[PDB]
Amino acid sequence: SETKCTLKSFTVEKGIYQTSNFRVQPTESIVRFPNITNLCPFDEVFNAT
Amino acid sequence: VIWMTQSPSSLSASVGDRVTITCQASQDIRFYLNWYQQKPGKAPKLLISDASNMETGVPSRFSGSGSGTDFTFTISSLQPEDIATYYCQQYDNLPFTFGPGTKVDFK
Amino acid sequence: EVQLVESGGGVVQPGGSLRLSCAASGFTFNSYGMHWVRQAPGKGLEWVAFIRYDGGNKYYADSVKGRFTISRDNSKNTLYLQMKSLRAEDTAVYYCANLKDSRYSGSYYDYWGQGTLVTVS
Numbered sequence: 001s002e003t004k005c006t007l008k009s010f011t012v013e014k015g016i017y018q019t020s021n022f023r024v025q026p027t028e029s030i031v032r033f034p035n036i037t038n039l040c041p042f043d044e045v046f047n048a049t
Numbered sequence: 050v051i052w053m054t055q056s057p058s059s060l061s062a063s064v065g066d067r068v069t070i071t072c073q074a075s076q077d078i079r080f081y082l083n084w085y086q087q088k089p090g091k092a093p094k095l096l097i098s099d100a101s102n103m104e105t106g107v108p109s110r111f112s113g114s115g116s117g118t119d120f121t122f123t124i125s126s127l128q129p130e131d132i133a134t135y136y137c138q139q140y141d142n143l144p145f146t147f148g149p150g151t152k153v154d155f156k
Numbered sequence: 157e158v159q160l161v162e163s164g165g166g167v168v169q170p171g172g173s174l175r176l177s178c179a180a181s182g183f184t185f186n187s188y189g190m191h192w193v194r195q196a197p198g199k200g201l202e203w204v205a206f207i208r209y210d211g212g213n214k215y216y217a218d219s220v221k222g223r224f225t226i227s228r229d230n231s232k233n234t235l236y237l238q239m240k241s242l243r244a245e246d247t248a249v250y251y252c253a254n255l256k257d258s259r260y261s262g263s264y265y266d267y268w269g270q271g272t273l274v275t276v277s
């Protein structure tokens with residue numbers, strides 16, 4: 001019926017008839033990055049004696 | 050996101066007493082709010098749909114009222130099977146948000 | 157007479173994946189938009205996902221939007237939740253719910269599942 005809807009007809013003669021497109025979607029979705037160098041210490045400003 | 054708050058989150062009352070539970074929203078939900086009851090260890094059973102329409106199979110002790118931002122669940126008498134946790138739900142904006150839930154206890 | 161039996165719970169390493177399945181048999185199904193609801197152990201009920209009657213529009217909670225996907229198979233009458241990149245804040249009891257909506261799904265009966273304990277350790 002896909003092919004019929006494509007040739008806009010109800011009779012499909014013999015042969016290969018290209019109808020649709022087959023793209024495979026994705027699953028996950030990562031987000032990589034680097035570790036963590038300096039860390040600008042709040043250790044000294046929130047925790048001074 | 051439509052935040053809900055429930056009050057009081059802890060409650061202890063004896064038999065025959067009345068219980069009011071206020072559900073407060075952060076936005077305006079007109080009359081779309083569900084009141085569930087969950088006994089500990091089981092799936093929650095619904096009690097009141099659209100904030101006032103009590104269901105079938107539930108006794109007539111429970112009642113719901115209020116509209117707009119403030120809603121009220123009222124138990125006119127505490128039978129021993131009223132000891133559970135009661136939850137809200139809104140319906141206007143997806144996602145639906147449950148309340149934190151109030152615990153009823155015996156004295 | 158309604159039966160919502162769920163499966164797929166177990167020990168999951170953090171960052172793993174699961175397929176929670178909900179076999180529904182009783183009501184007609186596929187005329188109702190169905191929900192996944194979760195409850196953390198010792199905490200209140202949260203919300204996970206909602207899918208319409210034809211699998212057209214899916215809606216997720218604002219905290220798990222992207223790590224879960226919700227699908228339905230109307231031929232075998234099942235709900236599926238693909239859970240990828242699980243943290244330790246997802247160890248819970250997942251219920252397969254049909255909430256007495258009346259604005260979006262338009263249901264009238266409240267049919268809850270039983271709940272699977274998904275422990276992410």
Ligand SMILES: *[C@@H]1O[C@H](CO)[C@@H](O[C@@H]2O[C@H](CO)[C@@H](O)[C@H](O)[C@H]2NC(C)=O)[C@H](O)[C@H]1NC(C)=O
Pocket residue numbers: 043047
């Ligand atoms: C704020 O400062 C105090 C004192 O410097 C920190 O307490 C130390 O904590 C570490 C690990 O928690 C221990 O090994 C030390 O023995 C503690 N020292 C003292 C004197 O108690 C505290 O951790 C600091 N806050 C933060 C967030 O790092």
